[PDB]
Amino acid sequence: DSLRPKLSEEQQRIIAILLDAHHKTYDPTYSDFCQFRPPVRVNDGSVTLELSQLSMLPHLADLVSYSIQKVIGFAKMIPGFRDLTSEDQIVLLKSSAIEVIMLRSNESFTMDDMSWTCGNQDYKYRVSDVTKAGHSLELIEPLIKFQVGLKKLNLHEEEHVLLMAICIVSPDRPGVQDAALIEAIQDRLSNTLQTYIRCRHPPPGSHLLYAKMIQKLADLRSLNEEHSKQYRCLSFQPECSMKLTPLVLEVFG
Numbered sequence: 001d002s003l004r005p006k007l008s009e010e011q012q013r014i015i016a017i018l019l020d021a022h023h024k025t026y027d028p029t030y031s032d033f034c035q036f037r038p039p040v041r042v043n044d045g046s047v048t049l050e051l052s053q054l055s056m057l058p059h060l061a062d063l064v065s066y067s068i069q070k071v072i073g074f075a076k077m078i079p080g081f082r083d084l085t086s087e088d089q090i091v092l093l094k095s096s097a098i099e100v101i102m103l104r105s106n107e108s109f110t111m112d113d114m115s116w117t118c119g120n121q122d123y124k125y126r127v128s129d130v131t132k133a134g135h136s137l138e139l140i141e142p143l144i145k146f147q148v149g150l151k152k153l154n155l156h157e158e159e160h161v162l163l164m165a166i167c168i169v170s171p172d173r174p175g176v177q178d179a180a181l182i183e184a185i186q187d188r189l190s191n192t193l194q195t196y197i198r199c200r201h202p203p204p205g206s207h208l209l210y211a212k213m214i215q216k217l218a219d220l221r222s223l224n225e226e227h228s229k230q231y232r233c234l235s236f237q238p239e240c241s242m243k244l245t246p247l248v249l250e251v252f253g
């Protein structure tokens with residue numbers, strides 16, 4: 001069959017809304033970064049020192065916090081999201097925030113040097129900057145892998161924003177009350193994505209890109225799980241909370 005239906009009027013609207021939501025919640029110039037607590041890079045080419053200093057934690061905690069604020073904004077503009085009870089909106093936001101952050105951060109990730117460049121160089125983040133924030137290689141290295149695997153999908157922005165949307169509106173998050181509603185909205189988003197890929201993505205000699213995109217959603221669950229383990233450890237460090245933000249405290253704590 002290899003049927004390739006045209007995007008409906010509704011699907012076109014969903015895409016345009018999502019593109020626009022993303023353009024309003026993602027600054028590709030990174031002009032707000034001067035407002036974050038400054039990056040501090042103490043020398044160490046050591047878990048003990050990293051935990052003792054947490055020199056990068058205030059800057060990256062502010063980075064992530066600001067990003068959670070943006071994701072919330074993004075989430076609210078997803079068609080259907082506001083049809084959910086505010087209870088379910090919060091469950092979905094809290095459990096997906098780290099995953100969407102990892103997704104959206106791919107826009108700053110570059111394979112030039114395997115860094116997130118929001119730059120200049122003060123605002124370039126590498127493996128070692130993230131260890132200076134108290135995380136370890138068990139999270140960071142798979143995160144870099146995931147970023148690369150994700151660049152090599154060469155997603156259209158349409159596919160990129162749809163993926164984050166699909167990520168947020170997942171029916172099987174623990175503590176969701178109306179799984180059916182959530183699943184209906186997700187299916188509309190997946191159906192749009194599936195339709196978009198078949199229409200607009202060259203060639204196809206086959207439709208594997210959708211499966212590859214859903215695989216990334218599963219990778220993200222692991223990354224989420226691992227971050228959660230490591231955040232818990234972070235929070236065992238005395239005076240750690242002041243280096244975070246209320247939003248970061250509430251979302252992961």
Ligand SMILES: C=C1/C(=C\C=C2/CCC[C@]3(C)[C@@H]([C@H](C)CCCC(C)(C)O)CC[C@@H]23)C[C@@H](O)[C@H](CCn2ncnn2)[C@@H]1O
Nearest residue numbers: 025026027028064067070101102104105108116125130231
């Ligand atoms: C968080 C983002 C960016 C990079 C993400 C990174 C690089 C550094 C380390 C990060 C934050 C990872 C770590 C493990 C999070 C650690 C969080 C804590 C609370 C300390 O456990 C997850 C994604 C990793 C930059 C950038 O892509 C964007 C920043 C904000 N922004 N810029 C334009 N629009 N929104 C994005 O939201």
